[PDB]
């Protein structure tokens, strides 16, 4: 085989932002956008070979293709080359991260990049990446599989790969999921002994501007719920937590935050609503409480399926932000249209 | 269905200028350059699938392709989401313009970018773009068909988005098309009540070095013939009007600018001669003439088909721009090739 | 035919410098460096159209793709239109030069950009190239063909498309080869009039940092061997030479550098063990030995096939440049997979 495949996905999106802080008109409200945005869309080129007595090569190149034209590049989307068989699958290259898949059944949202945050889970979602690495997964075993990933360390810091003067910043990635009779669990996360943060906690490069270099940083993620017989549910909780590691007169202090998210969705025929709720308690910083990182939000929505390849999508989001003054809210809305081929 | 498809094509270009104010070897003529040039490959993908009982769901996602290996990028040139069936045709993404489609019935000729203005009917043109938009084009009555297409505020400029302290650069496209017996007529234009143009009256992005603000800006394009019985005869009328909205001494004054065209083809069996004339007329600029802007162009040439998706094609080209000594004479002539996948 | 081809290939690869000027931890050596790369993948679009009459319009379009998503761009490996028949075949566009095509019987090797110099045959292919170019390539007629190959002034110089105030950088490229029962030699070779190279003996642009301009730029090469049987061996000679035409004291002054590599392989069933050999001499640089440019290296390795298309690959590097206390020490080894669909 060598398949052609890829979702062409899009809609209108209208945003609100509330923030005193940014914005003065009318108790810092900003005013109301209406755009035309691309959700996402994407184009693959994958195939597979036959290589006798069970084993098969795989590989797949995929790249983001948004019909606004704002994207370039091949294989800036999940790509690889790997093995399957008996043993299981293994693949290296730009890779979903352990995390990164166990979030689809986190967040089941389509949006634009404006409102991915308010659209979408996308909160509890700042964990999940690419990564360039190695994975292994698992086959099924009576309702059991996992996944073991790693990136290397010149991988993760090229510039220092030959003076490792730089501590490293490799990572681990595992994870385990089981499943009967729609019933599903799984657990998902990482460990890497350094890593760099930004102030909205996500993990950027090495000597990014505004990095903050941090030390252990684990995420640990356990998803839970049900999906058979048109009925979906789905319960979230997620761990975050990291020692600074920047020099100076808070190194070694303790970062952390708790995520939960929960998802219900019941099919009617061709239409499916949904609803989903979401809420990070305050953070510790530098070993303090932080506020600025609570939020609370919820999504409501449904998809009308006009076929298995094509569906029209509406939903509705409320966002809160932080506490008191530095306080930030976002409200949306959008109606959209996805075709996959 | 899912369908590749696109075009290469390329040929050898031969190009003098002849501007006093640039060069000054021997009355203001440049040198004879002589290049490899791609004319404008294209590869793209699109797909269709019928939804029941009349609709289809439909797509593309078309890139710019040189086979010099200029370009980077996925859907920059038509591509799109959207529905068809009994009520028309509904499309979303990045859209020519009713204006940009209508340029099929003026600008025949295949060229290189640095010969787009002599070897093809350029100026014309240069109304014409792809936009971030929404378009709907209407079934084919009794002869007529026309389409409607806006482009949103906050699409025309992101950065204002949640403060809308820019005026709207926001636009309407409108055409109206008629067919009878070989005969066709046809009316494209655009309204916006802002816009920016850059000194060629192009259309420019909002704060671009450089860019002219300006108000009440309308394009409007006629164009009539004839297209059967191995006859092609096409003329042209277009007329572009706007109000200076730059804040200085001139504000409120009025630019405008009449330009026509008009092409004659015969088949004789595998070869097609063609011929095409333009020209501008003097510019109106902040309310007083501007002969810079006046042009006379002709391009004689032919295409042989090799088959339906394979042509060589051959031309040549006349172009004067302005008047006096600002006065610039562009000469070109080519040799190409192009094929249809 | 429209026809979708390609190859995915990457491994992980282990590497360590010596070099006293750059390191100084215990004798000058580095540390080493263990890095997932991607080997070159690249994914094309080709087709071709029988005209009738012998004739054929041919075309492709080939782009780099590596599955560490580190490219963007269409065409930037040989794309072209031509027509094909008789006559043998030419084309236009974005095509290898003719040392380019002949480094196929001097270079076997799969490696990452950072270890092509030393898991690769790398330092003798410094001569080859994609250029927009035209080429022309005979049929084989008893055991002989040949190609010629030009690539304009206007091509390889744009800014000075009309003002030709700087001397060509046009350059020719040539080549011959015969074939006879397994046994092959061929010549290959380019001049240019005019040229540019960087430091490591590289053709670069004109007016690109550091580049030096050079006169009379010529490239000679010579590989024979044997390739049936199972038994592959090949054995190349290569001579570089050019006077100085930079402005200043040592204008005129001769470069020149010969080169020498052999390669030895034999099929034993799926697998396929390899040994090269490779010798830099002692380079003129403005008419003076420089033994900076001196060099040794070997690469020992497999192929492992799993079928005509999947090869699994490992090999093994020493490389040695420069002479004395500058001299610099690269040794490394890979694993790797390759994948052709
Ligand atoms: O997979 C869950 C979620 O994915 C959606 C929305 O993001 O579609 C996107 O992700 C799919 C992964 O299965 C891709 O196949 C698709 O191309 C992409 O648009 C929905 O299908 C689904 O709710
Ligand atoms: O369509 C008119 C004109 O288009 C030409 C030359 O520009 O071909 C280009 O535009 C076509 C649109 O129909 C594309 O299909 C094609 O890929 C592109 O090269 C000629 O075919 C024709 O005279
Ligand atoms: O062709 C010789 C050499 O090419 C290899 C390794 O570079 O494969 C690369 O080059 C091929 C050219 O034939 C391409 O077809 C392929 O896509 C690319 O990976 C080996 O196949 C061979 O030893
Ligand atoms: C949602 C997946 C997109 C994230 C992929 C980008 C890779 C970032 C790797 C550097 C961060 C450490
Ligand atoms: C000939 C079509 C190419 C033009 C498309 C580029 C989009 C420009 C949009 C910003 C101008 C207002
Ligand atoms: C190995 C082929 C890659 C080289 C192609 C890049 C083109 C360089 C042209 C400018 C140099 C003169």
Redesign the interface.
Known sequence: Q?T?Y?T?????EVS??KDAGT?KAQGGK??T????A?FG?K?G?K?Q?D??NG?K?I?Q?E???????????????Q?????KGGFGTVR???LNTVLKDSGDNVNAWESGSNTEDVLGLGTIGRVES?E???RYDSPVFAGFSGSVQYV????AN?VD????TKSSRESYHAGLKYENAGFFGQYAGSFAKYADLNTDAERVAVNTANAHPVKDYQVHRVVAGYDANDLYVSVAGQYEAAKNNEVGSIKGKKHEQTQVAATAAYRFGNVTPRVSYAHGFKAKVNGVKDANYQYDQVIVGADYD??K??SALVSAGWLKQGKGAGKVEQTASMVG?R?K?
């Open positions: 060598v052609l890829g062409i996905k899009a809609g209108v609100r932002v914005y900003s005013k956008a209406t755009q035309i691309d869309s184009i080129f195939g070979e290589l006798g084993m090569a590989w190149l790249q983001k293709a948004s019909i606004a034209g704002t994207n370039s590049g091949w294989g800036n989307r790509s690889f080359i790997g093995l290296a290259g730009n690419r360039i690495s190695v290397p360390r010149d991988n090229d790969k030959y003076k490792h006009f076929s390849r094509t249209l075709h081929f």
